[PDB]
């Protein structure tokens, strides 16, 4: 930008309806701070966000280290406080060819004094004179009454800790909404009724893609069932709702009487009422716990060696 706003009034711009190519962001080799809390810069090309907010101001060298989530000082407490669960990161670089003129650049004003601690992501523009003692301060500027905004001394020959650094703060939000801003990754064709692992708007899972007749509200993007698993996909390229059919859905219990002891095993299906089975086999027996195949059934009652469930016991005999 041709100019940057002050510290007490930081300009924030919403970024949306575009793909965010971060490859020209973390590979600039001209910035000075890229400590990104939470998400990693290598994963920024894969994740998808609801919206991107980019704050901006100009700060000195000594206060660029105190814009972390948990910190204190005269900037994090009074001027710009990040949340403890902040997503994204700040970006700072040297600004000496610009924003540095002889005689001091007193255009910017930081909040030296304030009545209370600043809430996260809150911008405070107030010029009321702060008082200290019990004396009234109705617009006066006497003793124990100072202007809350203090100017900055930015000279080309000033110290490195007091040099003006252009700070831009990228913040990412993850809300229950379609992601209008995503990484520069492309998109392949859509397949149906096949057990294919998928990558839908940053959500990765394996399943079978099937058409869903459910009506989906525009506010939501993902549908979760009682089991808290993915069931609905918006698919923003085509904007149609697909039901995620799991590749494996039933309960299978394998009655294995060891490996070296015997090579014959029995398969018990919990959700099958004896088909969607591995094999038909023989000696199909239906119990209260489900359908059991590959094991014989007898009318005798022996001791329980390998329990099956609901009083059903199976053993390896001659």
């Amino acid at each position, epitope marked *: 930008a041709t100019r940057f706003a002050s510290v007490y009034a930081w300009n924030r711009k919403r970024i949306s309806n575009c793909v965010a190519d971060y490859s020209v962001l*973390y590979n600039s080799a001209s910035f000075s701070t*890229f*400590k990104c*809390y939470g998400v990693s810069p290598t994963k920024l090309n894969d994740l998808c966000f609801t919206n991107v907010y980019a704050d901006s101001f100009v700060i000195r060298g000594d206060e*660029v*280290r105190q814009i972390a989530p948990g910190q204190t000082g005269k900037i994090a407490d009074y001027n710009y406080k990040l949340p403890d669960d902040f997503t994204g990161c700040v970006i700072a670089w040297n600004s000496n060819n610009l924003d540095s003129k002889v005689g001091g650049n007193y255009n910017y004003l930081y909040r030296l004094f304030r009545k209370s601690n600043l809430k996260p992501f809150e911008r405070d523009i107030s010029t009321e004179i702060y008082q200290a003692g019990s004396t009234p301060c109705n617009g006066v500027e006497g003793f124990n009454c100072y202007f809350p905004l203090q100017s900055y001394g930015f000279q080309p020959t000033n110290g490195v800790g007091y040099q003006p650094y252009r700070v831009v703060v990228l913040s990412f939000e993850l809300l229950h909404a379609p992601a209008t801003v995503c990484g520069p990754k492309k998109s392949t064709n859509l397949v149906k009724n096949k057990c294919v692992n998928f990558n839908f708007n940053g959500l990765t899972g394996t399943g079978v893609l099937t058409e869903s007749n459910k009506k989906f509200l525009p506010f939501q993007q993902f549908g979760r069932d009682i089991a808290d698993t993915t069931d609905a996909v918006r698919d923003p390229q085509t904007l149609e709702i697909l039901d995620i059919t799991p590749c494996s859905f039933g309960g299978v219990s394998v009655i294995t009487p060891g490996t070296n002891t015997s090579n014959q095993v029995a398969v018990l299906y919990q959700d099958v009422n004896c088909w969607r089975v591995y094999s038909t086999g023989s000696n199909v027996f239906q119990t209260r716990a489900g359908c059991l195949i590959g094991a014989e059934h007898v009318n005798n009652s022996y001791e329980c060696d390998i329990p099956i469930g609901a009083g059903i016991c199976a053993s390896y005999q001659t």
Partner: antibody
Amino acid sequence: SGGYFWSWIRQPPGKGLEWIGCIYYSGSTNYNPSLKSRVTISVDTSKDQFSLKLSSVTAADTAVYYCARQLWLRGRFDYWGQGTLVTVSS
Amino acid sequence: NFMLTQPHSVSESPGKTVTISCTGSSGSIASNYVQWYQQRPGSAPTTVIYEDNQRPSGVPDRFSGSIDSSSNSASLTISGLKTEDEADYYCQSYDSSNVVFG
């Protein structure tokens, strides 16, 4: 492919690691200020390799040289190469 | 003129904790992250702790890392030592067009 940063790292025997220079998949190069004007790293995409060129080698340059991929410009040297021994002797 | 300073040799009895500190010279340590490496003798160094406290696959949970902007130092804490932990340890950070080591 991938936009990964290839770099070189050296270390004298019994001493600390020293970073030589970093390269991109294009011709952009970054060098350490202490050893500037002595290194020229290039990328040969046809042979899928990146090399290093040191001029005016001194007796203190005897070190184990490493080449390491970087997942990110200011990130970890995640994958390292085997340590080759280069000794300066007449 | 940024360099990282750490003690040359720190030893401790097995079964207890040990703290290794890496302190920057001029610039801050709260920017451009930090990386921890462990170099077994006669082998290439391997990443142990990257980012603030992130750990790659194949590294035990005992390797814990933390930062301290007020003290301008980076700390790596090892608890429950072992024979295989006897190796050189390094701290790595990034500066303008150059990567620094310790």
